[PDB]
């Protein structure tokens, strides 16, 4: 049930790391290179572990992860849609 998501991704507790730009994510527990304004201390309900593409703030673009690249703080992650 965690492998399928609908729209902007607040229900994805998946595993994908690769973004739409082919760039890896930075760990949710890591302040380097990006200091998480939202981290696994204010929203423990969400499953934010290692560098998995997770959207906890319900952003319209889609499931995201704090991008490893210093250039961009957050980028989406390729995924199909649950339930066709």
């Amino acid at each position, epitope marked *: 049930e965690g492998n399928c998501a609908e729209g902007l991704g607040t229900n994805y507790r998946g595993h994908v790391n690769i973004t739409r730009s082919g760039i890896e994510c930075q760990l949710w527990r890591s302040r*380097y290179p990006h200091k998480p304004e939202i981290n696994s201390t204010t929203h423990p309900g969400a499953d934010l*572990q290692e560098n998995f593409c997770r959207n906890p703030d319900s952003s319209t673009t889609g499931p995201w992860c704090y991008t490893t690249d210093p250039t961009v703080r957050r980028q989406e992650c390729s995924i199909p849609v649950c339930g066709q």
Partner: antibody
Amino acid sequence: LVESGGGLVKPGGSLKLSCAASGFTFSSYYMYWVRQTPEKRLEWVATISNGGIYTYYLDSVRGRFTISRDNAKNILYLQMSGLSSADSAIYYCTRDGERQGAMDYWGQGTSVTVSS
Amino acid sequence: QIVLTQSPAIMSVSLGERVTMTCIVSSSVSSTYLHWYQQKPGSSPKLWIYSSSNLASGVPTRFSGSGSGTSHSLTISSMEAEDAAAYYCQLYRRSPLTFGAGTKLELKR
């Protein structure tokens, strides 16, 4: 800051081992356990999250080791099982730290071996 | 990714000479996920380099981190001799995480 790191030689089977870690807050940092075989080789042996929510393990370590911590008592624990001859190692308990899955504060280091 | 190989096994470097330690990993899926350490003879390991070229606290400023693809190498250029230790290369990779093979830095007299 400081971890104790007890333990000793066990020739038969499982060993109960732990590090008493205090000085910082255990509600904000992951714990890491690292072993070092006598042939100067380290294989990371499991790691625990800020609670008991998510714990890891190596390919040969899954199903044998076990990492859990007690935040209130400021103690970090590690239980081994099926300690074969190749499993002898100088283990180190380590603080997550520095972000990005680093190894901030390594413990004192306990020498553990098996030999009958 | 997933796994990691190191190179070489044993070095015997002198005092005041530039030193490198390659870490041939498979394609370096995250150039800022690889770290190095030391282990002085009889000690616990201490972090030196975390997430490529960014030193931890108290690390001598003579270290460096490359790693723009499939090859990560340190560059220690220091006049002091205390750097004699077994430096280990670790790339963070979740469950299949692996350390280096050891690049034990011995001395020369």
